[PDB]
Design an enzyme around this catalytic site. Structure first.
Site, PDB file in Angstrom:
ATOM      1  CB  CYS A1124      -0.837   0.127   1.174  1.00 59.60           C
ATOM      2  SG  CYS A1124      -2.698   1.045   0.922  1.00 59.60           S
ATOM      3  CG  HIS A1249      -3.260  -3.374   3.519  1.00 63.65           C
ATOM      4  ND1 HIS A1249      -3.967  -2.426   2.941  1.00 63.65           N
ATOM      5  CD2 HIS A1249      -2.253  -2.827   4.036  1.00 63.65           C
ATOM      6  CE1 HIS A1249      -3.720  -1.136   3.216  1.00 63.65           C
ATOM      7  NE2 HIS A1249      -2.484  -1.199   3.869  1.00 63.65           N
ATOM      8  CD  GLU A1251      -0.414  -5.277   5.568  1.00 66.49           C
ATOM      9  OE1 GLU A1251      -0.456  -6.073   4.580  1.00 66.49           O
ATOM     10  OE2 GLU A1251      -0.484  -4.235   5.639  1.00 66.49           O
TER      11      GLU A1251
END
Ligand SMILES: Nc1ncnc2c1ncn2[C@@H]1O[C@H](COP(=O)(O)OP(=O)(O)O)[C@@H](O)[C@H]1O
Ligand SMILES: [Mg+2]
Ligand SMILES: [Mg+2]
Ligand SMILES: [Mg+2]
Length: 1284
Positions: A1124, A1249, A1251
């Site tokens: 990002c 994302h 994560e």
């Protein structure tokens, strides 16, 4: 350009085209409609640099480069009339604050301040004087900007004024009249007895009061700050009442203190949480680690109703911003987690989309329309939540404006003055819940933003800079992360009254006094008077107390985060307030605290009860079919996508249940659920209950229903003991309006003295806004809000995995209705009535307290036992909407019979009594009905039928068909409101694409295809050796998603290290010691000057750090990941990364809107070492960005990039094909590109994302058979294995 500007020089730098094609056509269309013969319009950003010293050739090139950003839009040669729009003189835009920060962090101290404007070039060679001013009007916000005819006029924006002296009010030389004059002049709004108080106070002191002292007093004694109504004595219908409104609220704590750690003694309440692994970077090592300890839960809900009526964006943004400060300032420091949002406005009257029940009643010229509020308000609230970094997971949005026969007869009731509500939860450590003692000599500090004249039409225009608050939160985090060594003795948010309220509040709470120096406070406007500096309500500021010997440590923490702070005072034993001014060598304030905080007599409200009679519903124009169509078109009922996808719903990586539900991501989740930590299934839940319209018929009922709905909305979550649920009660009313006062008291009594104590529900926090009405001359007219109680429920969750949603299953099932209305089927004050311009006779109400408690307990029993397939409670729109929304979420049909619900089918389907529908496996129907019976709900339970594969929504009553229609058709009608809102606010093409896809029933919804074993931990062999490679988790000021990134690498066997750019510049960290690095998501510098640009350029222009990065990237075995904001940053660093010459840029989404989506992507073939073994896989991933659109220089660049084979991830629609259609592809990236890697595969950057969703429980929707790990965990494990 470069010309003198006072003692400085001002450079004018041309920027890039500022408006896309659809934005320009919208302007042209707007001109035509207004009879303005505009032929063409072009716009360009223009930058202004106020310099305090010269720039050499190198520095000049650097500044010019910093100001080169944004979409590569068509550039034109200026032609036509120049109209420059800039912030109004005397104001500094947040853009300026962040842009100037970037310049400084790039070593350009000569830049005193950077500001930006928009140069409009208008070709309309036939307009008159009035016409040109009308054109000007259409091009700027009159409350925040101004229009100039020359670029040189921008010099007015940098004028430095000399400090204005304090002014005394001549009480001694004029008598009482001096205070009367000042009350009017300064707009103090003092009551007659307050003037009396002040007159005696100062006559006794023997000196004239300074304007600053009077202003400070006035603000602290306003209804907004003192809450006189909620503390007043009452006499209702001749009978004095024993308790104040506040005492009745506190009664809920006196009765149920269970699990409460803090209430009525801080800026938020705190309740017990769970012992879990709190994850954060150690102060000494910088390594992220889990700390098994209690993560307690704080909660708070606030409003910003008046501000939002004047300037919606800032009003809503700071509504959230202020509440976030309340959270972080809880105890001795805390951390915000998730948030909620609420809106109440009048009819939207969308152009070309007018609804049958809407009528233009007019409005004051000085306020904005309901449509404007719902257009700009949500974006402002989302702007703060997104940039600061907290997911917005639940909320409400109601529209109401009608002429009704209520308590005071026929009147206009609505929300011209809106309800803008913002709240949330956070986590706090046990040892920090209680404020510490303020030692004499303690240093008094202001943490945060500089002072500007914002507190005080224009006085209600706020200003938000979320990135500044983010920098402050990082400091607060460092402090509480020191546990026993936490330097913060006492912290408090700065809100109403500015420092004039916050600082005296702080020392007073600690039983101390304080001596302050006016010139120590950070200020960005030299002309301010002592009154303005001390009383302004500038944002993103905190006040705290630290021991003198802890100053060095505190300074270290602030410098590392680049968080501004200043010691402005010292706590004293003497409880006196002193404010000195070194510049004028005098004392603006010199008062005993007992005098300043002294109270005038308590308020007594002697009122009487007004009760509307109510009138039977006229069903002349009503039919069940037409009612369905109308109800689905009431904004209150209709799909809320435009309020959901604009706000991040994944930041923190702890979001388990967001508003979007199932494969089709339909926004109907009844409550929000977050995990307590990144390593537990324990969590927190938030829900909202609200039913204002009912208050137009029954005050007490409206309050009971708000409580009841909060309960039914949260019921399908695993909580257990009902006493775990804590409430925030926010009371909105037009105090003084006939009947409202007695109504408010009866309502507070209904919940504080009766309902909540009986259910066992505590209300440890809350607030009130008591002037919810608007008056104006339409040719006098008045729009008065109904008493509006908004209940927010918060609770510790036992297992986030067992939460149920409205997503129906089509496996053999049974739909059971739990009608807590007990057959009353009330239609008064319902969506149905509203849609036919009526209020009705009798509204719903809590019919049986014991059965409501029983309902909750039964639901908890069913949830814990895993006996439910789905749940959806009944509220706006009745059973009809409940069933419809369940069919929408399950993308299926319904076949139900309502013969057992009464002969009145209209009332049966549209009443809004409490309850809902549970879906259970067909083989469990008897057992479930038996369980419900055990809780005394037998005659409330009704078997309706079943959910069936298909598109039919059928409701029968014996052999009779009551209503039948295509579920898809209903689904689309239900979506028309968000469609229309999105079409007028965002790129029309995108709004249309998203809406039209809803009409295709063949959409299979999100679905997965896996090329590998999601459960095989290929890193285990490495982790088992105990050797843990370090990974530099890189962040910069403003970055907000680093903890979650570290956690992902951590599970893969890495030792995640917190590496701030300040650490690199300071030599505290060196990349040469790492083999892996990752640039994090967030809003570095708030994306000012282009997302990721300030971060990247600050690296490039600081040659030492630049060399460090280049060296890292050129080593043979290093690995780098950019996610990002990190993806954007690295894409702007290509010159330092080998094999990246073909990389694209990442710019503003085609939709021109921030997109928080759960998008489907496919892993494509590329050299990327991090996507190894994942090629061909198709799975959903978290998306949260406003500038993720891949942009190439030309097709030659796109073709080259593709042919080189560097594309690693592509957005695909649910049918599985690469797409550029919205929102399947949320940003409009060509060929669906959203991730690229380098020739050698050692560096990969992506916009989504990974994560945030490495934990299956954090996936909005996911296959049922998945374990703890989602497919995305493999990226981090691949990194670990690759390092060996
Ligand atoms: N203003 C808002 N901001 C963010 N989310 C909202 C807002 N209003 C409603 N929502 C969300 O949209 C979904 C549907 O809203 P609504 O129908 O009002 O909820 P319910 O009737 O179940 O109480 C919910 O998940 C809710 O949290
Ligand atoms: Mg609803
Ligand atoms: Mg609901
Ligand atoms: Mg609701």
């Amino acid at each position: 350009g470069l010309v003198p500007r006072g003692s400085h020089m001002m450079e004018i730098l041309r920027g890039s085209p500022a408006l896309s094609a659809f934005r320009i056509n919208k302007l042209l269309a707007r001109f035509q409609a207004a009879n303005l013969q505009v032929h063409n319009i072009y716009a360009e950003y223009v930058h202004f640099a106020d310099l305090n010293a010269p720039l050499n050739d190198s520095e000049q090139a650097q500044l010019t480069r910093l100001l080169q950003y944004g979409p590569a839009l068509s550039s034109h040669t200026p032609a036509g009339k120049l109209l420059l729009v800039t912030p109004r003189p005397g104001t500094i835009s947040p853009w300026s604050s962040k842009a100037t920060d970037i310049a400084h962090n790039c070593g350009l101290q000569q830049v005193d301040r950077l500001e930006r404007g928009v140069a409009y070039y208008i070709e309309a060679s036939t307009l008159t004087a009035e016409q040109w001013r009308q054109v000007a009007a259409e091009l700027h916000d009159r409350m925040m900007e101004t229009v100039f005819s020359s670029l040189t006029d921008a010099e007015k924006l940098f004028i430095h004024h000399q400090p204005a002296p304090v002014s005394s009010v001549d009480l001694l030389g004029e008598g009482r009249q001096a205070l009367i004059d000042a009350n009017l002049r300064l707009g103090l709004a003092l009551a007659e007895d307050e003037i009396d108080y002040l007159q005696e106070a100062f006559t006794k002191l023997g000196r004239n009061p300074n304007d600053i002292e009077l202003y400070m007093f006035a603000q602290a004694n306003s209804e907004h700050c003192r809450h006189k109504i909620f503390n007043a004595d009452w006499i209702i219908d001749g009978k004095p009442q024993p308790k104040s409104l506040f005492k009745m609220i506190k009664n809920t704590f006196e009765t149920t203190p269970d699990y409460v750690l803090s209430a009525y003694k801080d800026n938020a309440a705190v309740m017990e949480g769970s012992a879990v692994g709190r994850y954060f970077a150690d102060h000494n090592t910088g390594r992220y680690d889990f700390h098994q300890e209690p993560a307690h839960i704080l909660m708070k809900v606030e409003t910003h109703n008046h501000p939002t009526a004047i300037s919606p964006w800032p009003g809503a943004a700071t509504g959230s911003g202020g509440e976030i400060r309340d959270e972080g300032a809880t105890g001795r420091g805390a951390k915000p987690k998730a948030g909620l949002v609420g809106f109440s406005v009048s009819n939207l009257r969308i152009p070309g989309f007018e609804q049958p029940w809407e009528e233009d009643f007019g409005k004051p010229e000085r306020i904005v329309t309901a449509l404007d509020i719902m257009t700009e308000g949500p974006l402002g609230g989302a702007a703060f939540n997104n940039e600061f970094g907290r997911p917005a997971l639940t909320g409400y949005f109601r529209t109401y404006e009608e002429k009704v026969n209520s308590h005071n007869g026929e009147e206009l009731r609505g929300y011209h003055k809106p309800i803008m509500l913002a709240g949330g939860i956070g986590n706090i450590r046990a040892d920090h819940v209680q404020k510490g003692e303020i030692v004499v000599g303690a240093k008094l500090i202001v943490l945060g933003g500089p002072a500007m004249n914002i507190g005080l039409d224009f006085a209600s225009v706020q200003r938000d800079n979320p990135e500044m608050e983010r920098r402050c939160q990082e400091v607060i985090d460092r402090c509480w992360q020191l546990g026993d060594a936490n330097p913060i003795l006492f912290i408090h948010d700065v809100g109403a009254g500015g420092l004039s309220n916050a600082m005296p509040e702080l020392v007073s709470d600690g039983g101390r006094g304080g001596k302050f120096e006016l010139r120590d406070i950070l200020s960005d406007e030299p002309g301010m008077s002592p009154l303005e500096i001390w009383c302004n309500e500038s944002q993103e500021r905190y006040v705290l107390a630290v021991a003198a010997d802890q100053l060095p440590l505190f300074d270290e923490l602030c410098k590392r985060e680049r968080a501004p702070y200043a010691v402005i005072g010292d706590a004293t034993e003497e409880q006196h307030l002193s404010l000195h001014d070194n510049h004028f060598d005098n004392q603006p304030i010199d008062l005993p605290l007992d005098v300043l905080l002294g109270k005038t007599p308590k308020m007594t409200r002697d009122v009487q009860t007004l009760k509307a009679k109510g009138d039977a519903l006229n069903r002349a124009d009503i039919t069940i079919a037409d009612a369905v169509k109308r109800v689905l078109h009431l904004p209150t009922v209709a799909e809320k996508t435009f309020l959901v996808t604009i706000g991040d719903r994944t930041v923190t990586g702890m979001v388990a249940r967001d508003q979007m539900v199932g494969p089709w991501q339909v926004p109907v989740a009844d409550c929000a659920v977050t995990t307590a930590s990144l390593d537990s299934y324990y969590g927190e839940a938030m829900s909202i209950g609200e039913r204002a319209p009912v208050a137009l018929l029954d005050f007490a009922a409206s309050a009971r229903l708000a409580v009841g709905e909060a309960l039914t909305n949260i019921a399908a979550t695993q909580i257990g003991d009902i006493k775990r649920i804590k409430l925030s009660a926010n009371w909105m009313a037009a105090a003084g309006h006939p009947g409202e006062d007695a109504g408010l008291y009866d309502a507070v009594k209904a919940v504080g003295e009766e309902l909540c104590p009986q259910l066992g529900l505590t209300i440890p926090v809350g607030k009130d806004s008591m002037s919810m009405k608007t008056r104006w001359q339409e040719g006098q007219r008045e729009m008065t809000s109904p008493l509006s109680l908004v209940i927010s429920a918060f609770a510790r969750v036992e297992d986030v995995r067992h939460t149920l949603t409205p997503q129906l299953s089509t496996e053999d099932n049974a739909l059971l209705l739990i009608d807590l209305g007990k057959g009353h089927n009330a239609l008064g004050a319902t969506a149905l009535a509203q849609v036919y311009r009526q209020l009705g006779d009798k509204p719903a109400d809590v019919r049986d307290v014991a059965q409501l408690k029983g309902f909750y307990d039964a639901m908890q029993a069913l949830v814990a036992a895993r006996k439910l397939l789905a749940w959806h409670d009944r509220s706006d729109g009745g059973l009809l909407v409940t069933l419809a929304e369940m069919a929408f979420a399950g993308h299926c049909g319904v076949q139900v019979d309502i013969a057992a619900l009464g002969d009145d089918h209209l009332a049966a389907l549209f009443n809004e009594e409490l309850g809902g529908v549970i879906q259970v496996r067909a083989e469990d129907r008897d057992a479930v009905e038996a369980l419900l019976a055990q809780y005394g709900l037998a005659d409330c339970v009704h078997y309706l039928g079943q959910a069936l594969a298909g598109d039919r929504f059928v409701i029968t009553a014996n052999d009779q068909t009551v209503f039948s229609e295509s579920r898809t058709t209903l689904r689309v009608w239900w979506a028309e409101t968000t469609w229309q809102m999105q079409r007028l606010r965002d790129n029309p093409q995108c709004a249309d694409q998203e809406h039209e896809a809803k009409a295709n029933d063949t959409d299979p919804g999100l679905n997965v295809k896996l090329s590998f074993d999601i459960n095989e931990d290929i890193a285990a062999p490495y982790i088992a050796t105990g050797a843990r490679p370090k990974v530099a988790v890189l962040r910069e000021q403003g970055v907000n998603s680093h903890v979650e990134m570290a956690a992902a690498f951590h599970r893969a066997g890495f030792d995640a290290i917190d590496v701030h750019m300040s650490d690199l510049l300071g030599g505290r960290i060196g990349l040469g010691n790492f083999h892996a690095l990752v640039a994090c998501g967030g809003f570095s510098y708030g994306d000012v000057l282009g997302a990721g640009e300030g971060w990247a350029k600050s690296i490039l222009f600081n040659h030492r750090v630049r060399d460090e990065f280049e060296t890292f990237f050129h080593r043979p075995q290093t690995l780098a990941l950019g996610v990002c904001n990190g993806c954007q940053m690295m894409s702007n660093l290509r010159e330092l990364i080998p094999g990246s010459e073909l990389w694209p840029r990442f710019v503003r989404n085609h939709s021109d809107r921030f997109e928080a989506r759960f998008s489907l992507v496919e892993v494509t073939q590329s050299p990327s070492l991090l996507l190894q073994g994942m090629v061909g896989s198709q799975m959903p991933i978290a998306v949260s960005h406003g500038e993720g659109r891949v942009e190439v220089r030309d097709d030659a660049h796109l073709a080259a990039l593709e042919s080189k084979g560097l594309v690693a991830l592509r957005y695909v629609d649910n049918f599985g094909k690469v797409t550029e259609t919205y929102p399947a592809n949320p940003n409009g990236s060509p060929n669906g590109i959203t991730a690229v890697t380098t020739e050698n595969g050692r560096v990969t950057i992506m916009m989504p994302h990974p994560e945030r969703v490495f934990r299956t429980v954090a996936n909005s929707w996911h296959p049922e058979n998945w374990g703890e790990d989602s497919p995305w965990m493999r990226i981090f494990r691949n990194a670990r294995k690759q390092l060996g």
